[PDB]
C-alpha cells in the first residue's frame, strides 16, 4: 500500500523521525539531541569550506588564518561561525549531559557509555583543533597536554617522543594534528549513529521517570516544529556572537605568532576545559593529578552503578534535587578557580572544589537517595 | 517405500585410512585431526608474522 | 504517640508534602521504578487495580505536559495513600531470592 | 600415540588455549629462524657488493 | 554487593576455570613479549638472544 | 527399620546351569504364583548378507504358524487353553521368544517352546501369505517418522557394513527370499551354544533344568564345519542424511556419536550424564521449573515439541546422542541449546547435577525390574552380552563411584571434537549444514 | 486432550459415555472445548472442599510400615473431615450419537446396561466377555478360539477387527462389543458380530469353553496385579468400594464359583435390552438401532 | 537464547555476513566486489598516513612528496602502496562490471 513504509530506504527514515512513538509530555531539555546533530554538521560544513584555503605548514599556517580573514570573500563569517560554534557544541554537550544526570536517564547502559565515547572523542576533536591556527596558545596547549602522557610510568617520554614525532612540537606535530582534527568528526558522526541505534531499542525517557506506553504521540509533527523551534533558536544565539562580539569567548594572546622561547605569564585553558584543569592543579603531584583529571571524567561510567533510589528522576526527590544544584554551583566553582592565577587563597578554595565534587558524586548523593527510601517506607 | 534407502558407495573419496569397512576408525581419528589442524596451525604462524 | 514516633511521623508526612507526586494525584507505588520484580508484580494485578493505575498515570503525564497541577481538593491525603502493589513485589522478591538460594548449593 | 600427529594432537591441539599458545611461541621462534635465512641467501646472491662487505677497506 | 555468587557450586566453577584463564592469561603475556620486542625479558632466552 | 543396602543385598540371587549339547538354563526364584518363560538367541540382522537380509524377520513371522507335531492352527488354540500370553521380537543382534503364564503351566509351556526353535514347518502357502503381509507392513512403516528416522541414522553411521542393514530388509529381498534360504538360516544360527533358556517367577531351579534336559537335548551344538559366524569391528563415520519433505508439519532429527559397547566400563558414567541433561514432551507437568536447563528453556520458549537422549550399545560399538521432533522454524535454537549443554558437560560439571543423575539413574534401575518380564528380559540379555547377571550390588557400587571429574573426563572422551552422525526428515530447510555442527562440538574459549 | 483425541477409541467411548447415561456417568474425562480458560479458582475449592474429605479417602503404602502412615494421617489428615456432598444417581437412557470425519475405517460400539461392579452378576459377565473375545493372546494370532472374530470372518473377506467391551462401576455397568472395519463392511460385521450373541443367548453354549474363558479370566487377573503399580491400583479400588481387602484366592474361588446358566442369563439380559451406540467415520453404510 | 542472533548490534551483522543464505555455485568472479571492500579500505589506510606528512602549498608540494620517500621512515612503502592501490582498484572495479554486464545482473 504505503511506499513510505515498504521502501528499503524509507523504513528507516520513518522508523526513526515519522512514526516514532514519543512521550507527549517531554520538555526542552530534550531539544539538546537534535542541536548537537545540527552543531556538528555545521562544524563539518563550515570546517570543510576552511580547508580549502588553509596550508599546515608552520611557516605558514599563521599566516594562511589572515588571507582566510582578509582576502577569502566572507572567510571572515566562516572563521568565526567554526569558532563560535565549537562553544555552542560543548554549551549543548553538557546541557544534553546535566539532563540525563537529573532525570535519571543514565539506566540505558549501553546509551549512556557510548554517550561518554562521544564526550572524549568530541574533546580531543576540539582539543586538536586549537592547535592549527599556531598562536601561543596553541604551542603551549599542545606542549602542556602531550606532555600528559610523560606523567606514565618507564614508557611515557616514548609515548611523547612517538606522537610529537620529534624531541619538541614542529612541523610534524601540526601536520598530523591537521589530519587527526579533518578525520576524526566522520568516526564522530557514526559513532552518534550507533548512540542513536541503541535508543530507539527502549525510546525515551520523560521528566517524571514513569512509563509512557500509556501516552504516546507520533514524533512528526509535533517534535519536528518543536525541534526547528529550538534550532532557531539555536541559529540566533550562535549570530549573536558571531555579529556583535566574536572575540568575547577567545584569548588575545592566540593572535600573536608562536613563539617557542617565551611562554606568556596569564596562560589559561578554553573555559570549556577550564574546571578540568581547575582539578589537576589543585593536587601537588604530577601522577596524582592526572589520574584525578582522567577519573573527573571517567566517573561518568561509575554514576549508573551508584544509583540507590526506587524512583527514577530527582523530580520527586528533594534532597536529590538540592545535592545536584550544589554539584552545579561546585562546578561553577571550578571553573571560575581555573581562570585565576595560583596564589592564596584561590589555592586552599580550589582543593575544597575538588574534594567536594568528588565526594558530592560518590558518597552523599547515594547516601541521600537511601534516606529516601527509608522516608517513603520502601 | 523407504528402507530401500542405501547410501552410495564414497570409497572414490575417503583416505586410505578409513578404506577398510572391518576395521574401528576411533584408531586413526587422532593422527587425522591433528595433521588438519597443523595445517591450520601453520597458516595461523604465516599470517601473523 | 510517644516522643520519637510522632516525629518520625512528622517527619515523613512532611517529606511526603514535599516530595509533591500527591498534586498530580499519584500514589506512592505509582511513582516506583519499573524492573523485572516491579513488572511482574504489576502483571500480577487484578483487572480493576490495574485500570485504575493506568487511568491515574495517564491523567498525571496529561497534566505533566500542560505544567499544570489539580486543585488543592484533590490531591492524595498522605493517610489514604494505599499500598496496593506491596504485597505482590513482595511475594515475587521471596521467590527470586528462592531461587537464588537454591542455585548456590 | 606412536605417529607425530597423534601426539601433536592429544598434546596440544586439544585446547584452543594451548593451541592459541602454540601459534604465538611458533611466531616467536619462525621471526628469527627466516629472518636469518632470508639475510643469508640474500648475502650470498650479492657478494663483494653490499656495503658491509666493502666496510674493512675504508674504516680504520 | 555481589553476594549471590558464594557458595559450593561457585567455588567448584571457579577451580574448572582456574587452568583455562591462567592459560589465556601466558597468551596474551608471551603476545605482548612478542610483539613489542621487549629486549628485557628477550634477552634471556637462549636462541632469541641472538637476534640482537 | 530397612535400609537401601540392605534392601539391595536381600535379593535372591540368579542361578545358572549350562546342558551338554551347550544350552544355559538360567532362573530367578520368586513368591509369585505366575511366571514368564522364554528362550533368547544370538541372532540378528547383524549376521546376515545382503543376499538373504530380511531372514529372520521372515522366520519370525513365521514361528507361531504350525510345526511338523501341531499342524495349521492348533498351537495357538494350545496356548489360549490355558490363557497364556505368547510373544516375540526381533533386533539387529538379539531375537526372543517368550510366554506369560501361571506356575502350574510351567511344564507345557516348556514343551511349547522347544516345538517352536526346533520344528518350523515352513508350509509354502503360509509362506505367500506371509510375503504378502510384510509387503503391506513395509508400505505401512513409512507412516512412523521416529523409525524412519532412526533407520537413516543407523545407515549412515555404519554405511557399509553390516549394522546399516535394518531388521526387516529391503522390500526387493523379501520377494525373492525362497523356503530354502530360510532352511539354511535356521541351519545355521539357531544353535545350543547361542541360546539362552531364561525363566522367572514361581517355579524352582531344578525342575526347569530337568525340564531342560528333557525337551532340549535335540539341538546341536557342535558348529559345524567353520560354519562360526563371528562379527567383526564395524567403521564408524561422521556424516549427514537429510530428506526434505515440506509437505509434512513437524521435523525430526537425530545427532549422534559413537559409543563404547556393551561391556566397557564407561557406559555407567554415560547414563550419568545423559540423566542430567534429561527429556522433555510437551504434556510435562513441571513446565519453566525442570531441573535440566535443556528443558526448561524449551518449556519457556517452545523450542520443540519433545527431546530425548539414547545410549544404544552393540559389540564393540554405538549410539550415544539425542532425537527431537520441533517445528521447522527451531531447529537452530534446538541444536545451539543440544551443543551447549554437552559442552557444559565436557568442561565444567559440578557435585549437585551428578548427585540428581546418579539418584535418577538408581530409581529408574530399581522401578525397570519389577515384575517377570523384565527380569526374565535381564536374565536373557545378560548371559549373552556380559556372561553372567550382574546383581544390583555391584550396580550400586559402580553407580556410587561416579563424580564430577570422572563425568568430565568420560564426556571429553566421547563428545568433544568429534564427528558426529546426522538424519533428518521432514521440513529440515533450516537444520545447520554440516560444517556448522561440526563447529559447535568444541568451544573457542576451552 | 488433543493428544488423548489422536485415538479414535477414547472419542468414540466417550461419545458412547454420553449417549448410555443422562446425568452422572455422562461426563467426559476432558475438559469441553467451550469451557477451556473459564474454570475460576472459585470453582476448583469448592470441588475440593466438597469432595476431598476423610470418608471418601484411601492412603495405600508398599514399602512402608503401618505406625508411620497412621502418623502421618493421625496428623494431616484428619483435620480435613467435614464430608460434604453425595452425588446424583446413575440414570440409564440410551440412545444414539453418530460423528461422521471421512477417516479410512469406521469404528464403532454397541452396548447396553449390565451390573454393578462387585456383584454376582458382574462375575458372569466378566466370564461372557472371555467367552467372546478380549483381543488376542498371540503375537498377529488369528484369534482362532474367539468366537466372535470366527463368525464375523466367516462371511466378512476384508481386514476388520471386533471385541468385547465391560466397564463396571459402583451402581451401574456396560457390556457389549466394539467393532473396526471399512466403510463398506461395517453393516456386515455388526450384524455378525449381534447375530453370534443372538445364538450364544438362545442356549448353544459349549461347557470347555466356558472352561477356557473362566481359565483366561483367572490368568489375566492374576497376571495384572504382579506389578507394583497394579498392585497398588486394585487394593485402592478394592479399599473405596468394598472397605475391606479381598486377597487373591477368594477371587479365584467366587470365579470358579460361576455356574454356566448364569452366563446365558447374561447373554439374555444384553439381547433384550435398550441399546446405545456411538459410531465414528464415514457413515455412509452402518446401521440404526432399528435396523439391527 | 544465542545474543549473536537477538543483540541490537550484532544482529546486523549476523544477517549480513554469517547467516546470509548464498547460492552455491557462485565462481571465482563474484570474489572482486568483496575485494573492491578491501581495496577501498586500504586506501583509506594508508592514504591517512601520507596526510601526515603532505602540505598542499604550491611551493612545498613536490618537495613534500620526496621527503616522504627519502626521509620518512618506511614512507616509500605507503607511497607507492597508495599510489599502485588506484589501478588494483580500477582492475577490480572494471572487472566487476564486465561479471554485472555477462551475467545479466543489472535487473536489479
Ligand atoms: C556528539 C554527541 C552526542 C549526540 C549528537 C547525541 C545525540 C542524542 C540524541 C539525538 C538523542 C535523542 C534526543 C534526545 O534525547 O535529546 C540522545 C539521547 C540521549 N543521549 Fe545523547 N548525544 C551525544 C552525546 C551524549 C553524551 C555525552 C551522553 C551522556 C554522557 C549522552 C546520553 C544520552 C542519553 C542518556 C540519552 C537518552 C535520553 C532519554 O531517553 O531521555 N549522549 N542523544
Ligand atoms: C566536531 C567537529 C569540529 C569541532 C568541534 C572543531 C573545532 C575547531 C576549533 C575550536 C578550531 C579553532 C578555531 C580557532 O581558534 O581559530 C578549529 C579550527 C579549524 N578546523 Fe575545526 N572543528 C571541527 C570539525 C572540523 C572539520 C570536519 C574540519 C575539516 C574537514 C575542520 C577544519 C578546521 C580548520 C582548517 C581549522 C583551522 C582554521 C581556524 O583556526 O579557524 N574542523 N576547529
Ligand atoms: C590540564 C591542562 C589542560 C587540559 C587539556 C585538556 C583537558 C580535557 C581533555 C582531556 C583529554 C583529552 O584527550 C583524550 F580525549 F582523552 F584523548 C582531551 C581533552 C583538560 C585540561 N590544558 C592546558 C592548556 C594550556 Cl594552553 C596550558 C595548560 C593546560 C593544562 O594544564
Known amino acids: 500500500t504505503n511506499i513510505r513504509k515498504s521502501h528499503p530506504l524509507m523504513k528507516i527514515v520513518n522508523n526513526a523521525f515519522i512514526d516514532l512513538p514519543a512521550p507527549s509530555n517531554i520538555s526542552s531539555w530534550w531539544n539538546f539531541g537534535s542541536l548537537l546533530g545540527i552543531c556538528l554538521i555545521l562544524q563539518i560544513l563550515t570546517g570543510l569550506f576552511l580547508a580549502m584555503h588553509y ?137 552518534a549513529m550507533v548512540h542513536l541505534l541503541f535508543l530507539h531499542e527502549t525510546g525515551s525517557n520523560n521528566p517524571t521517570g514513569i512509563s509512557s506506553d500509556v501516552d504516546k504521540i507520533p514524533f512528526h509533527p509535533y517534535y519536528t516544529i518543536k525541534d526547528i523551534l529550538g534550532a532557531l533558536l539555536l541559529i540566533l544565539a550562535l549570530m549573536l556572537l558571531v555579529l556583535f562580539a566574536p572575540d568575547l569567548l ?59 533510589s526506587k524512583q527514577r528522576s530527582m523530580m520527586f526527590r528533594p534532597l536529590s534535587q538540592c545535592l545536584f544544584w550544589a554539584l552545579v554551583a561546585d562546578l561553577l566553582t571550578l571553573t571560575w578557580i581555573g581562570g585565576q592565577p595560583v596564589e592564596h587563597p584561590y589555592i586552599t578554595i580550589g582543593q575544597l572544589a575538588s574534594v567536594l565534587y568528588f565526594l558530592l558524586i560518590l558518597v552523599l548523593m547515594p547516601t541521600a537517595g537511601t534516606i529516601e527510601n527509608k522516608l517513603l517506607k520502601w | 517405500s523407504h528402507t530401500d534407502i542405501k547410501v552410495p558407495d564414497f570409497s572414490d573419496y575417503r583416505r586410505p585410512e578409513v578404506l577398510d569397512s572391518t576395521k574401528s576408525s576411533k584408531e586413526s581419528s587422532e593422527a587425522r585431526k591433528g595433521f588438519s589442524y597443523l595445517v591450520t596451525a601453520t597458516t595461523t604462524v604465516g599470517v601473523a608474522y | 504517640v510517644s516522643a520519637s514516633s510522632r516525629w518520625l511521623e512528622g517527619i515523613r508526612k512532611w517529606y511526603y508534602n514535599a516530595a509533591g507526586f500527591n498534586k498530580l494525584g499519584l500514589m506512592r507505588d505509582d511513582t516506583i521504578h519499573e524492573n523485572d520484580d516491579v513488572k511482574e508484580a504489576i502483571r500480577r494485578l487484578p483487572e480493576n487495580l490495574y485500570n485504575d493505575r493506568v487511568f491515574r498515570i495517564k491523567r498525571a503525564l496529561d497534566l505533566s505536559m500542560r505544567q499544570q497541577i489539580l486543585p488543592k481538593e484533590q490531591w492524595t491525603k498522605y493517610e489514604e495513600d494505599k499500598s496496593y502493589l506491596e504485597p505482590y513485589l513482595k511475594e515475587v522478591i521471596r521467590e527470586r531470592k528462592e531461587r537464588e538460594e537454591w542455585a548456590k548449593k | 600415540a606412536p605417529t607425530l600427529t597423534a601426539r601433536l594432537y592429544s598434546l596440544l591441539f586439544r585446547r584452543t588455549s594451548t593451541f592459541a599458545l602454540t601459534i604465538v611461541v611458533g611466531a616467536l621462534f619462525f621471526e628469527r629462524a627466516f629472518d636469518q635465512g632470508a639475510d643469508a641467501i640474500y648475502e650470498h646472491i650479492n657478494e663483494g657488493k653490499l656495503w658491509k662487505h666493502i666496510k674493512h677497506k675504508y674504516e680504520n | 554487593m555481589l553476594t549471590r555468587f558464594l557458595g559450593p557450586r561457585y567455588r567448584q566453577l571457579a577451580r574448572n576455570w582456574v587452568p583455562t584463564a591462567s592459560l589465556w592469561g601466558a597468551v596474551g603475556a608471551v603476545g605482548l613479549v612478542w610483539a613489542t620486542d621487549w629486549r628485557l625479558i628477550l634477552d634471556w632466552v637462549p636462541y632469541i638472544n641472538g637476534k640482537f | ?183 539354511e538360516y535356521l541351519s545355521r544360527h539357531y544353535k545350543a551354544p547361542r541360546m539362552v533358556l531364561a525363566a522367572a517367577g514361581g517355579l524352582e531351579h531344578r525342575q526347569l533344568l530337568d525340564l531342560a534336559q528333557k525337551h532340549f537335548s535335540g539341538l546341536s551344538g557342535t558348529y559345524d564345519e567353520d560354519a562360526v559366524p563371528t562379527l567383526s569391528p564395524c567403521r564408524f563415520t561422521g556424516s549427514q542424511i537429510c530428506h526434505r519433505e515440506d509437505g509434512l508439519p513437524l521435523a525430526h532429527v537425530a545427532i549422534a ?58 559389540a564393540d560399538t554405538g549410539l550415544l546422542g539425542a532425537h527431537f521432533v520441533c517445528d521447522h522454524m527451531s531447529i537452530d535454537d534446538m541444536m545451539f541449546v543440544l551443543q551447549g549443554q554437552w559442552m557444559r558437560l565436557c568442561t565444567s560439571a559440578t557435585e549437585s547435577e551428578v548427585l540428581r543423575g546418579k539418584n535418577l539413574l538408581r530409581n529408574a534401575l530399581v522401578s525397570h525390574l519389577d515384575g517377570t518380564t523384565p527380569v526374565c528380559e535381564d536374565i536373557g540379555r545378560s548371559l549373552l552380552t556380559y556372561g553372567r547377571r550382574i546383581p544390583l550390588a555391584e550396580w550400586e557400587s559402580r553407580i556410587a563411584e561416579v563424580d564430577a571429574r570422572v563425568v568430565r573426563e568420560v564426556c571429553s572422551k566421547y563428545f568433544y571434537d568429534q564427528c558426529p552422525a546426522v538424519a533428518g526428515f521432514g521440513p529440515i530447510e533450516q537444520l545447520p549444514d554440516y560444517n556448522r555442527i561440526r563447529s559447535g562440538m568444541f568451544w573457542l574459549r576451552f | ?170 451402581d451401574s455397568g456396560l457390556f457389549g462389543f466394539y467393532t473396526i ?99 465414528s467415520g464415514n457413515l455412509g453404510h452402518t446401521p440404526f438401532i432399528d435396523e439391527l
Open chain 1, 250 to 308: 577567545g584569548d588575545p594572546d592566540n593572535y600573536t605568532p608562536a613563539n617557542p622561547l617565551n611562554t606568556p605569564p596569564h596562560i589559561k585553558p578554553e573555559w570549556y576545559f577550564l574546571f578540568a584543569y581547575a582539578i589537576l592543579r589543585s593536587i601537588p603531584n604530577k601522577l596524582g593529578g592526572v589520574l584525578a583529571l582522567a577519573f573527573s571524567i571517567l566517573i561518568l561510567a561509575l554514576i549508573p552503578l551508584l544509583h540507590t
Open chain 6, 257 to 314: 556419536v559413537e559409543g563404547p559397547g556393551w561391556a566397557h566400563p564407561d557406559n555407567v558414567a554415560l547414563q550419568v550424564a545423559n540423566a542430567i541433561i534429561g527429556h522433555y514432551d510437551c504434556t510435562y507437568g513441571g513446565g519453566a521449573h525442570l531441573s535440566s536447563p535443556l528443558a526448561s528453556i524449551a518449556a519457556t520458549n517452545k523450542l520443540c515439541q519433545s527431546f530425548q537422549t539414547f545410549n544404544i550399545c552393540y
Open chain 1, 55 to 191: 596550508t599546515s605548514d608552520t611557516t605558514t599556517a599563521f599566516s594562511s588564518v589572515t588571507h582566510i580573514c582578509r582576502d577569502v570573500n566572507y572567510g571572515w563569517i566562516i572563521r568565526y561561525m567554526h569558532a563560535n560554534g565549537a562553544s555552542m557544541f560543548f554549551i549543548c554537550l553538557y546541557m544534553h549531559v546535566g539532563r540525563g544526570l537529573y532525570y535519571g536517564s543514565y539506566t540505558f547502559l549501553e546509551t549512556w557509555n557510548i554517550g561518554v565515547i562521544l564526550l572524549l572523542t568530541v574533546m580531543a576533536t576540539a582539543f586538536m583543533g586549537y592547535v592549527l591556527p599556531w598562536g601561543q596558545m596553541s604551542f603551549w596547549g599542545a606542549t602542556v597536554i602531550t606532555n600528559l602522557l610523560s606523567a606514565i610510568p618507564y614508557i611515557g617520554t616514548n609515548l611523547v617522543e612517538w606522537i610529537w614525532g620529534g624531541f619538541s612540537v614542529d612541523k610534524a606535530t601540526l601536520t598530523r594534528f591537521f589530519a587527526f582534527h579533518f578525520i576524526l568528526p566522520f568516526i564522530i558522526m557514526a559513532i
Open chain 7, 181 to 279: 472395519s471399512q466403510a463398506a463392511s461395517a453393516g456386515d460385521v455388526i450384524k455378525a458380530a449381534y447375530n453370534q450373541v443372538k445364538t450364544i443367548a438362545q442356549g448353544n453354549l459349549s461347557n470347555p469353553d466356558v472352561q477356557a474363558a473362566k481359565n483366561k479370566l483367572k490368568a489375566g487377573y492374576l497376571m495384572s496385579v504382579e506389578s507394583s503399580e497394579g498392585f497398588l491400583d486394585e487394593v485402592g479400588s478394592q479399599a473405596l468400594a468394598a472397605g475391606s481387602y479381598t486377597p487373591p484366592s477368594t477371587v479365584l474361588q467366587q470365579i470358579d464359583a460361576v455356574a454356566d446358566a448364569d452366563v446365558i442369563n447374561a447373554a439374555k439380559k444384553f439381547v433384550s435390552g435398550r441399546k446405545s451406540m456411538a459410531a
Open chain 7, 1 to 170: 486432550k488433543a493428544v488423548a483425541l489422536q485415538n479414535p477409541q477414547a472419542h468414540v467411548i466417550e461419545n458412547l459415555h454420553a449417549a448410555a447415561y443422562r446425568n452422572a456417568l455422562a461426563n467426559s474425562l476432558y475438559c469441553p472445548d467451550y469451557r477451556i480458560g473459564k474454570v475460576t479458582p472459585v470453582e476448583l475449592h469448592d470441588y475440593v472442599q466438597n469432595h476431598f474429605t476423610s470418608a471418601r479417602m484411601a492412603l495405600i503404602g508398599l514399602g512402608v510400615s503401618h505406625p508411620v502412615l497412621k502418623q502421618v494421617a493421625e496428623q494431616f489428615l484428619n483435620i480435613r473431615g467435614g464430608l460434604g456432598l453425595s452425588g446424583a444417581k446413575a440414570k440409564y437412557h440410551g440412545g444414539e450419537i453418530r460423528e461422521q470425519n471421512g477417516d479410512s475405517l469406521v469404528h464403532a460400539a454397541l452396548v447396553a446396561e449390565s451390573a454393578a461392579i462387585g456383584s454376582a452378576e458382574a462375575n458372569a459377565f466378566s466370564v461372557l466377555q472371555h467367552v467372546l473375545g478380549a483381543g488376542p493372546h498371540v503375537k498377529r494370532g488369528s484369534n482362532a478360539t474367539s468366537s466372535l472374530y470366527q463368525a464375523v470372518a466367516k462371511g466378512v473377506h476384508q481386514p476388520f477387527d471386533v471385541s468385547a467391551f465391560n466397564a463396571s462401576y459402583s
Open chain 6, 1 to 183: 527399620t530397612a535400609t537401601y543396602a540392605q534392601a539391595l543385598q536381600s535379593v535372591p540371587e540368579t542361578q545358572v546351569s549350562q546342558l551338554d549339547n551347550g544350552l544355559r538354563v538360567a532362573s530367578e526364584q520368586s513368591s509369585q504364583p505366575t511366571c514368564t518363560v522364554g528362550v533368547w538367541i544370538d541372532a540378528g540382522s547383524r549376521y546376515e548378507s545382503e543376499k538373504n537380509n530380511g531372514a529372520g524377520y521372515f522366520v519370525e513371522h513365521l514361528a507361531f504358524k504350525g510345526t511338523k507335531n501341531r499342524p495349521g492352527n492348533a498351537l495357538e488354540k494350545e496356548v489360549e487353553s490355558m490363557g497364556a500370553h505368547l510373544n516375540a521380537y526381533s533386533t539387529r543382534e538379539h531375537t526372543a521368544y517368550y510366554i506369560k503364564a501361571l506356575s502350574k503351566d510351567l511344564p507345557k509351556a516348556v514343551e511349547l517352546l522347544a516345538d517352536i526353535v526346533q520344528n518350523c514347518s515352513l508350509e509354502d502357502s503360509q509362506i505367500e501369505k506371509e510375503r504378502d503381509v510384510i509387503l503391506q507392513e513395509l508400505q505401512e512403516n513409512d507412516t512412523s517418522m521416529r523409525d524412519v528416522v532412526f533407520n537413516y541414522l543407523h545407515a549412515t553411521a555404519f554405511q557399509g557394513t553390516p549394522l546399516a542393514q535394518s531388521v526387516e530388509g529391503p522390500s526387493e529381498n523379501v520377494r525373492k527370499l525362497s523356503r530354502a534360504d530360510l532352511t
